[PDB]
Design a protein around this ligand. Structure first.
Ligand SMILES: O=c1c2c(O)cccc2oc2c([N+](=O)[O-])ccc(O)c12
Length: 327
């Protein structure tokens, strides 16, 4: 399997663009940034809000708790290559953290409003708008030969007041190379694509489109997460209970994949459950034929059948967003 788009991006670029291991950081000075308070944590990162001592503006300080250095260079190299892209967080500086020998990434400040409180208030139009903004970020990073691999509400910061969106945490992001087999223990459980769950390792940018689909489904149906599995095996079961096993079967057959016996039994057999079956009084104001058509084209077992970020952006669902933009 290989990406249907942007497959040769890293093939055409200098080895220095994607060879993150050869990266040598220009360590800045730690006293240049002052921590003001904690704001959260990734899987292996402590995040704080700070202030640049020199120019007094606000910044974000992400201390990469022991991640592994190979992994630290990867994230830095990717952030450097993506800086300036639409709706992508911007890396301003890189320093050493006193309490530890942990690198510490300084980002431009991003005001975010917790999605758990924000999402319930978004109107039909707001959802179209923000998803389109997120799509701009994905088509951009894909066009630059990079897969984010951890798309989820938690990594999409939105300033609802200024209507600004930023795709964050590129700690699991990677460079796409045709035919390469990647690790499947990426992304967060609820947003893991079928490829990660059946061990199809030569996956590509399309993985992000599945995760986007999961986020989108949770938003329009007001059910988060939309696929609520309790472990990776159960996650595939939850997906199969909605998309049906008929399609799962065609997929496994196409890619010559054999589900282990345990997982195959857990999956069982299920008929497809119509998207409209998920509509109720709480989400009626968000479920429209265009929303469902767009969603349907994202949540496909076959990663090769999913919309690309560029195609997604031209879907009629976003027609008003584009119209408004062309002015
Ligand atoms: O990983 C990040 C992150 C995280 O894991 C958990 C909670 C907040 C975060 O914020 C970030 C911000 N930010 O808030 O501007 C910028 C870049 C990042 O990588 C992160």
């Amino acid at each position: 399997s290989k990406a249907r788009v942007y497959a040769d991006v890293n093939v055409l670029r200098p080895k220095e663009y994607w060879d993150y291991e050869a990266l040598t950081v220009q360590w800045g000075e730690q006293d240049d940034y002052e921590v003001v308070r904690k704001v959260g944590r990734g899987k292996y990162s402590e995040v704080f809000e700070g202030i640049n001592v020199n120019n007094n503006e606000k910044c974000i300080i992400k201390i990469l708790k022991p991640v592994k250095k190979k992994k630290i260079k990867r994230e830095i190299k990717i952030l450097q290559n993506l800086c300036g892209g639409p709706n992508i967080v911007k890396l301003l500086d890189i320093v050493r953290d006193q309490h530890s020998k942990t690198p510490s990434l300084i980002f431009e400040y991003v005001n975010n409003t917790d999605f758990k409180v924000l999402y319930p208030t978004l109107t039909d139009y707001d959802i179209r708008y923000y998803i389109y903004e997120l799509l701009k970020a994905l088509d951009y990073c894909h066009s630059q030969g990079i897969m984010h691999r951890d798309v989820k509400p938690h990594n999409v910061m939105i300033d609802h007041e200024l209507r600004k969106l930023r795709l964050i945490d590129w700690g699991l992001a990677e460079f796409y190379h045709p035919g390469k087999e990647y690790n499947v223990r990426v992304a967060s459980r609820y947003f893991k694509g079928p490829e990660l769950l059946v061990d199809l390792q030569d996956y590509d940018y399309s993985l992000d489109m599945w995760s986007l689909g999961c986020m989108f489904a949770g938003m329009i149906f007001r059910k988060e997460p939309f696929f609520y599995g309790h472990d990776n095996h159960d996650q595939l079961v939850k997906i199969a209970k909605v998309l049906g096993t008929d399609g799962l079967n065609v997929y496994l057959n196409k890619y010559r994949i054999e589900l282990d016996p345990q997982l195959e039994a857990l999956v069982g057999r299920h008929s497809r459950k119509p998207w409209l079956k998920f509509m109720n009084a709480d989400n009626q104001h968000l479920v429209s034929p265009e929303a469902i058509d767009f969603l349907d084209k994202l949540l496909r077992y076959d990663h090769q059948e999913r919309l690309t970020a560029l195609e997604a952006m031209t879907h009629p669902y976003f027609q008003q967003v584009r119209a408004a933009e062309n002015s």
